[PDB]
Design a protein around this ligand. Structure first.
Ligand SMILES: CC(=O)Nc1ccc(Nc2ccccc2)cc1
Length: 165
């Protein structure tokens, strides 16, 4: 039911879309969140997905952290997708603005391989400070499952498509 996507590879698709609106429309099995290790969904994609759940994602996340402790950078956890998806896969890409190792981006994308189909943002892009062109390259070279990438910014989407090798 994903519509309007440009096919980049056998398994990677891309669209200029707000991932919240895309999730509300498709109600995919899995929506990926651009999470941090504490699951504090303050801004970027995380803040937007959490706001769309009326903070239910944050309440569930705080209980998860209270029980399990923080995630690792490069790691993930599966929680409810609330009103957006069946599940939310909270994936922690390295935050270059926190001085985290960009080399952990491949480990972060490997989490996507545990799900046959996902709606996702580019990991470590936006407020996480990594080059989105590099994130897309790591995505295509790491993810083997079917990933539908939503890129909020039109200008960035055009740059990503036009520079895709
Ligand atoms: C709104 C938005 O995400 N815009 C945006 C931000 C950064 C880049 N490019 C870039 C980042 C870090 C390092 C090298 C290039 C491209 C587009």
């Amino acid at each position: 039911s994903f519509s309007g996507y440009l096919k980049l590879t056998d398994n990677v698709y891309i669209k200029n879309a707000d991932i919240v609106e895309e999730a509300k429309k498709v109600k995919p099995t899995v929506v990926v969140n651009a999470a941090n290790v504490y699951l504090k969904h303050g801004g970027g994609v995380a803040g937007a997905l959490n706001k769309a759940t009326n903070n239910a994602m944050q309440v569930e996340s705080d209980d998860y952290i209270a029980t399990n402790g923080p995630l690792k950078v490069g790691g993930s956890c599966v929680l409810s997708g609330h009103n957006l998806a069946k599940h939310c896969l909270h994936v922690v890409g390295p935050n270059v603005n926190k001085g985290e190792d960009i080399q952990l981006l491949k480990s972060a994308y490997e989490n996507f391989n545990q799900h046959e189909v996902l709606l996702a943002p580019l990991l470590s892009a936006g407020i996480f400070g990594a080059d989105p062109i590099h994130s897309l390259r790591v995505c295509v070279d790491t993810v083997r499952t079917n990933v539908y990438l939503a890129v909020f910014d039109k200008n960035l989407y055009d740059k990503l498509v036009s520079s895709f090798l």
